[PDB]
Amino acid sequence: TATESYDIHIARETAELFKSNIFKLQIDELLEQVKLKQKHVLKVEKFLHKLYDILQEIPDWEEKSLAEVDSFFKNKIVSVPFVDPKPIPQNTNYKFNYKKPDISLIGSFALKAGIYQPNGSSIDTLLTMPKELFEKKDFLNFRCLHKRSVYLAYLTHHLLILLKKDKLDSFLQLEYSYFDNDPLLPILRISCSKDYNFYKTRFSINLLIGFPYKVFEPKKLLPNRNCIRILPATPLYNFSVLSSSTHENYLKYLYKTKKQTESFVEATVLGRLWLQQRGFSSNMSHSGSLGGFGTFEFTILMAALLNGGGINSNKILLHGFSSYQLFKGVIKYLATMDLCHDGHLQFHSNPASKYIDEGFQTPTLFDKSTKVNILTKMTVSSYQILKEYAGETLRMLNNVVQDQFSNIFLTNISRFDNLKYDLCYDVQLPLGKYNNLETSLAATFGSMERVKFITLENFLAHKITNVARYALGDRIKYIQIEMVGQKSDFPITKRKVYSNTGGNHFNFDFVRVKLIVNPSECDKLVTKGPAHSETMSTEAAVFKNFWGIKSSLRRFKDGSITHCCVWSTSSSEPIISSIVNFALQKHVSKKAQISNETIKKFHNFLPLPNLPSSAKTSVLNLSSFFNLKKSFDDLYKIIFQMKLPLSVKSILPVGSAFRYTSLCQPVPFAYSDPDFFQDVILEFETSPKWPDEITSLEKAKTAFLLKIQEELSANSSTYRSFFSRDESIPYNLEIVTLNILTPEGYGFKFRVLTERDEILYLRAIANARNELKPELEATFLKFTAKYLASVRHTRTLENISHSYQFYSPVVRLFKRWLDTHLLLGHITDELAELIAIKPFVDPAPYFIPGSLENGFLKVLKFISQWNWKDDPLILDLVKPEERLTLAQYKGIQMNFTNLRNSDPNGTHLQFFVASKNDPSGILYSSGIPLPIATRLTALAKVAVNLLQTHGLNQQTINLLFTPGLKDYDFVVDLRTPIGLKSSCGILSAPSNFPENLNDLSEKMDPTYQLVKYLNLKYKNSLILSSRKYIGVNGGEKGDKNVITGLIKPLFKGAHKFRVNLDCNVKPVDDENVILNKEAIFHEIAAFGNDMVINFETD
Amino acid sequence: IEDISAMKNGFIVVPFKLPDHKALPASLHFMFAKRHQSSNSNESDCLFLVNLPLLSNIEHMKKFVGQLCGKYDTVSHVEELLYNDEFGLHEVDLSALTSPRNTALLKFVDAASINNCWNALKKYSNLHAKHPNELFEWTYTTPSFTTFVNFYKPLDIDYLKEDIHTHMA
């Protein structure tokens, strides 16, 4: 009913209003920003008018034999752009002629939907050859196309004459190209160099040669029909021929729809930009490009959805929809309504559009009026990717919290293949000439293939796609084959695009195979094939032939026996690399050379643990961490079950190993590793007997640890234990940890937490004089991070890591990178972890990372673009579709803006990083010196720039992990007397704990303590940085460290002598003093003494 | 600069020659000293010292005062170095709250000891100008490998047990 409909409509409007209104204003602004100025439209319309005159003056010539046209052109500059197969005298009875064309405009310019493009835009001018130039059999065997090419050539010759005459040839540029990069459809392109000069408008003019509507029986050109007699259907060929007859038809259809629908043009601009950012266009995708779906296809789809589109032909879009509603509705349809394997859309350009739930296994948008499949230019692989981008955009459009406009329209994700995709393989294919293919190509490219695929390039891209898809199975989600160096333009003096690059005579330099990985399956040992039975099924025969020597039979745990291939894991590369190499060399070309060295370099920058079969262990394998947890679990039981004066309530392990983030994988007995001792929080049942002052409280806690240690030593003597001071909570001098060494070779440090602790820190803040409150706040923050927030941080990251399998190795590599640049000492592990998770929990408009390279580069890219003065980082630490609500998100944003009100430049707090775990945004990022924050940003920019400039390769990757050590006041080289690489558990093996536990210390980093105490002494005046992981980053033996020093800007000039200056100073007169550099240098040299090898000063 | 023996606020300038290090290319460290005024009983006969050299301790300060006594044939006995918290570890009394950085006091055994030292320091402060080579070298305590790794060692269990057992009684 009308009232029912109205109520639903109002309910929906209200539900969508918040985002709808915001989006509209953003849309309005974008459209103004990209608006074509009327002066430019008018200026090209002036040239277009002259062009029409000139063209109208080209005289008809005469019916000519192929011999005659050949003679006509032989002596002239212009060549006929005959398509392959070019006509031979022996097989061409018909003849050729030119007569005056009907001129018309098509495309965006004709629909007045043009936008300002820095790169420029094309105006498509349609020149229809008269019907009498055609015989009704001309749709067959390239006849109409050869007629078309001569027609274009004759036109181009006479146009050149007439342009010379009007003096226009001095600023005009003429060249051949292919319409939509379709090699069957050469066109002429006119462009301007620096009154009819339209250079400043950024337009180019394409002269499209078309056929009259319905010159050939449309039913004879259906996708399932053959039109090249050699029979196999010729859908590619048929599309080129049939659509050459429908250009005006579609312009009329789109113009009519535009007139009916107020926001059509605006929605068209939104579609164009959305597709453009994602690397899509109308260009032919069959020859190794991402596309077949550009502005034209978007508008045709939108128009179809404005006249039905449901499974029962119901309207999807209404004529009164805002541009937001139109765009969103098209995206939603693309996301959810399958047009390839499971269905297709039928429409009538001349009646209601109907979704039909049978698929043709190729992208299909079928016009019942014209018999054209609008989506012919799209490969299956291009369509699958389009549908995923549509799904992601639909999710973004439904986000009622974080603003997605920039992600949707304003972010080019296509600039860098290594960010857009997870793995990219460069494939050299020196196939030689066409006559060489019998040996250079493993598959036959014969008569049937040429008829179906038209070009070798189409055949080759499809072959490589099909081979890689079958070989990789569920290891991947999406694939693109790219013909790199492919050209679309060629001189008017040439028949076609010619190439001799890449050791071949085809239109590409090499091929790039680009993958979106499936992390749950990508590095599995077994490629599963068909079931084994008595006689070979077709599927099993195919599998066996495809894999050859790699194929075997295997019994699975469930009792099944199937054909399979078994691969070897490697720490250095994904199994995918082996498979691509094997499959391409076997089934594409024996001459194929496959390389992907970038992924190996990133893999090899993760420290290799000294564990059995380490070099053969997947980067995705977490066994090291699982084995540590298993050891902990055994100890947990013993302590939890102990009879003590209070019962144990909780034992909560909170160390980096429990959330898979430790820089090095844990190795038994590797006690040199900074992360060897894993923190555990121990809580007893509540008790009113805990002391009400911090010294007595800590001693009471220690008394319980003593009882635990006593019981452990008595009845569980394969565990060893000792007590250690924790000096990291400033001014709490009595904290003791119980350090337990398990028989499996792992270390755990236990601290007690009571319900009294937080109360005492809060009381200390309340009691402190105003001047001191900041220091007590900082102490309380350190306490909170260690004892309170560590449990939720660890539980959250452990849990969601299962949905983000590449996060663990990515964050570990990120920490390694931070430590190589001496930053890790100032950046908490939690802050590093939360920055690194950004590309995983908030990937848009990219996909979630599916390789080590992809994730790591995304973290650096994020940092490079993060203006931490202006913007917070707010994370929804959840698995992919508990999320922050609108109110919660705005409340966190207000924490940031409040902070910036009194800290507008981020002098006190730079990186605001918040989540549901920490809405304050400052728990893990407080107390960082400003120069350290700026250096981190600077290094990320340096990294991104190095890669944009010099590309991603072995040399530039090495540079990412090399410190520059420039712009420092001083640099000190240290060497420890004993190398720690081995005892850190890194392969360049620890086997026991020392007899005397006092000797654990002999394999610990003395330079860590050195730098710790230097920072404590000189906190007021200097910033000192060093490596935290000497085993990892201290060279071949793990014995070299560096200290860099910065004098705080506060101490570069003189000051009044005051008793509380807290700086090593010298007098400059009897009233004023200045920092004394020479004395400080001698102090530092003396402090490190024999370990100080070199000391450089600015 | 050599002519600056005392600062305007009453602090005497007390320079030391810095020992050589293999890794560095005769520089001075400047400590500052003034007589301490305190109505507090345990802060009697003290010099307030600003900018003590790295890792200053009672042994180093006794050596210094002894060199002064030898040079100027005088008698001065040092009792204690007070409030030398070079690493800032005791800057806030968390214990009290839950119920002068880079400076210290050098305490002498009696009024005569400090007076003698103070007179000797006055003459010491004029050496920079008159006889710079007569300034005393400060030889830093130089922590060994063992000293740095000691920070990692277990707490002594028997000391700990005793400490905890007694405090809890």
Author numbering:
A (entry chain A): 81 to 274, 282 to 317, 326 to 445, 453 to 983, 1010 to 1116, 1128 to 1237
B (entry chain B): 3 to 27, 32 to 105, 120 to 189
According to the publication:
Utp22 and Rrp7, two interacting proteins with no recognizable domain, are components of the 90S preribosome or the small subunit processome that conducts early processing of 18S rRNA. Utp22 and Rrp7 are two proteins associated with early 90S preribosomes and form the UTP-C complex together with four subunits of casein kinase 2. Here, we determine the cocrystal structure of Utp22 and Rrp7 complex at 1.97 Å resolution and the NMR structure of a C-terminal fragment of Rrp7, which is not visible in the crystal structure.
The full-length proteins of yeast Utp22 and Rrp7 were coexpressed using recombinant baculoviruses in insect cells and then copurified and cocrystallized. N-terminal residues 1–80 of Utp22, C-terminal residues 190–297 of Rrp7, and several internal loops of each protein were not visible in the crystal structure, likely due to structural flexibility. The N-terminal half (N-half) and C-terminal half (C-half) of Utp22 are structurally similar to each other and are arranged in tandem along the longest dimension. Utp22 is likewise an intramolecular dimer composed of two copies of CCA-adding enzyme modules. The NTD adopts a two-layered α/β fold, which is similar to the fold of RRM according to DALI search (best z-score = 4.8).
